[PDB]
């Protein structure tokens, strides 16, 4: 009965029928995105209306459409034709992944380039790569993918070990035309294989690892009700799933005595971009918005018990739409479990004689997605002490190139003749805050050093300062690790027992933000990535930091346009957008398959509670 | 037979006898420090000589002594009388912890101060606090402790909830004289209790936590030989224990195929300091060198199975000396176990059809120490992929004060009338590096941003630069999170298969360093804490960043004096000293007992291996 329940197969089938009956889902139509809309502000009406938003592509060249449907009432709420030269192209379709390779295989320019390299066209894989917006005037308003080639020596071979450098092609996937083939010269195709399951490469497998058995003989400590509502160790929340964003957390609250206290209304990773830093014209256009262009939720893996998730696991299997509106289940796509997390609190007192130890634990909600060469794990953690943490785990296979004779300032060498271009993986977390309710504000907190002198005669004092962000035009902030900078989200109308406003502190990892030149195409299209923290006033239609249609959008959509409204954010319904990322100079140890590297952020209570919230944890 | 074996009870008993027979351990003598010396460079002689270093205090006022003893030969190697006004006082003795309270209880000035506050002297606990070096000329060459008072309402009461502010005393613990009693005014003693085991404060204990069972039905994957030699998943190392430093790791090496490759010769936390930032004269002198002044190893806890260490645990029980030279076992003082650590590597490939998942694990070596109000866990982690990580876990009870009416810029309020002064916890890791042998160098690596223009026409390129540190005078470095700064330790004479020098990259957390004014006493005595990274040339006697005798030392000992030698460190036997710490503005949630907070660092291979070192991990 909850409005935040996962989409059902029946709901998706009804959407299909509504669209079909309205004449919106003919044979030339494809669904590029379908998702449930969240309830509007003021859901205390109990009048449920389950609405779905749909992006509809047309493979014959007609204008695409954005459609909103009510499954509760069986009606089309609105349908708008999109001018894609203005507002952006629709996300990449899974069925387009093979179209680039197929169109190039019959193009004489492509074939002549492969012939010069003595490459069999049947062995050449072409990656379907988003195009961005650069100097090519003929691409405006056309649906373009770019292709880079990799050789597979046999069907089970890792093509990533064999990049074909000096060659790139651009394809119009609707008109089925190859617009440009660019061949800058012949590079040797690296010959070593990268087959990490080949015994010749792994050697004999270790026989030294003994089993670790993690079991819960009384079952888990959390309960799941209504399909996706979690209660665990005073936490309460709803686990949603969206095909663009992936796992979304709703209604994060903490039961403090008799009161359920809200903390976060909605938490998601609302964008992620992978900019490459190789200036070669073969790759200098590469910036993959894995979320906004490809939709990370639709490529979520089915997670295997014992391998991907270990322990007493509870699965959710979210349902999404395929390109024709049929429901499709991602079996075991979300893992949920609790984990021991070491010592929570400990003290042995010299005067009272009391020895005290308590153990910590965390609740884990996770999924894994695969986008071409990349594989990303998204982990949300809830801790006993009120801490909330997000962690991204990056693995998969690095994107490769030739390594130029004489070296490179922008590419790492991994194997003889094999390179990996420098790049970043940058995430945007969208945190619709609700600290004890919706009246919130953000303060920037810096350490303050003090000069030795009167009132500080021994030169030991230090302090802190807090600056309230009052308007959106002043709420675009940068990290400063040297001054210990953090941000506090507080509720000025809700005080703790010491009469101080309750709050939560955001702790960033302070990694570099977007490195590209500020005049670049990617700096305009991924403006969110140039700053660590943005605060906006909540609005229904301000969902993504890059706007609704990221593919081939010319730039400036999303956060820079939102904050131009300069709205009041001092004790208001606000949204925090936190940029964080990994800067990846690939190492030899990343090849042929990359060990996990991680990045994230956390929020800790800051005077939210009247004392430690874990005094009632028992002694194991 | 290994020279790196733990000290035995028999060795300590022999040291006792050697000292006694030489006339060095009469009734007025106390052992303030005793530890085994590491083998000198060039231990390939197999001629074992187990030597111990001893600091001997004299309770009658005679000069203390530093003594070196050979237990193998039964001889005193050297004995030097110490002029403590010059070189520093000896570490605090456990038996002095009660002496401050006892001496003050008979001093008329102290009693009159307690009488004005209507405090029963029998209920007043006095903390034995190290003195530092300030303006009091009469303290030079005298062994001074300072005392701050806390009320215990009954024997099991937490005295920390009841600080007696406005009052401090200084005591000469050898002459047994109270030198000064300073009373700046009457503050109310905070009345709320902080008894975290009192049901009136905890409420009913949770009944919602179900058990997590972690077992290893075939036993652990590591082996322990010779008492303290560990082999685990290609790692090899020796676990040492020293009463000053605690757990020390020796001979960290990795078996790469047929070769055992050294990485780190010796790893330890060689100092830790807690500076307070409250300018009140009652506390503005407070800077506790928990390692150098108090010796964290002697206060290591006995760790309980199921509570402190969970899973299949292997314990070590190190032996230390008491103040009279008797051996004393710290039962179950070190826990060792392996832990599952999630996903190691994962990829599902669109072209080969291969789905691949491997799990990670880590080896954990840990101990916990208690120094007055503080409790610290020290954790070393070894990962399958070659990563080495240190983590400190800070818990216990925050050091308290009154909260002044009208507020404070340097103290947090925790409860009515109860404050907690701002402070830092700053650690120094001493890493005697041995990357593939002893010829090492350090490079500082910064991200390099590039301007849009010729050769970078789309403004996307970025790069990195490495600067070799060639002399000690240029090897004092600061963090720069914004430029992604890291440090690489490499071996210029050992190349990987791509002909690049092998290396390891140090990743810091980039937390603030020492905040005190650079002209302060603590900035001179804890100079190491003012910079993130120091590199020195190895020398036998350069053990601690603060020098050998930290207590009441006037300043500048240790690292600033060492680097003045300006030795060559470019391809030499070098030692990296990394400063890292927590800046603690206490929150209400830290009271009455503090949930764990953490800080640390890690080292990851950087072209050390010829490819990923975990290709031979099996599929669970
Ligand atoms: Cu990467
Ligand atoms: Cu602290
Ligand atoms: Na446009
Ligand atoms: Na909000
Ligand atoms: Na001196
Ligand atoms: Na060394």
Curated annotation (Swiss-Prot), chains A, B:
Residue numbers bearing the 2',4',5'-topaquinone modification? 374
Which cofactor is essential here?
Answer: Cu cation; L-topaquinone
Mitochondrion as UniProt keyword:
no
The cofactor remark states: Binds 1 copper ion per subunit.
Report the induction information.
By phenethylamine.
Catalysed reaction(s) here are: a primary methyl amine + O2 + H2O = an aldehyde + H2O2 + NH4(+); 2-phenylethylamine + O2 + H2O = 2-phenylacetaldehyde + H2O2 + NH4(+)
Sites binding substrate sit at: 288-299, 371-376
Q: Say if the entry is tagged with keyword Ribosomal protein.
A: no
Q: What sort of enzyme, by top EC class, is this?
A: oxidoreductase
For this chain, one GO molecular function annotation is:
quinone binding
Q: In the Enzyme Commission scheme, what number(s) does this protein have?
A: 1.4.3.21
- Annotated residues that bind Cu cation are located at 423, 425, 584
- Gene3D superfamilies per UniProt: 3.10.450.40, Copper amine oxidase, catalytic domain
Functional note? Catalyzes the oxidative deamination of phenylethylamine to phenylacetaldehyde with the concomitant production of hydrogen peroxide and ammonia.
Subunit-level organization: Homodimer.
Q: Give the protein's recorded name.
A: Phenylethylamine oxidase
Organism encoding this protein? Arthrobacter globiformis
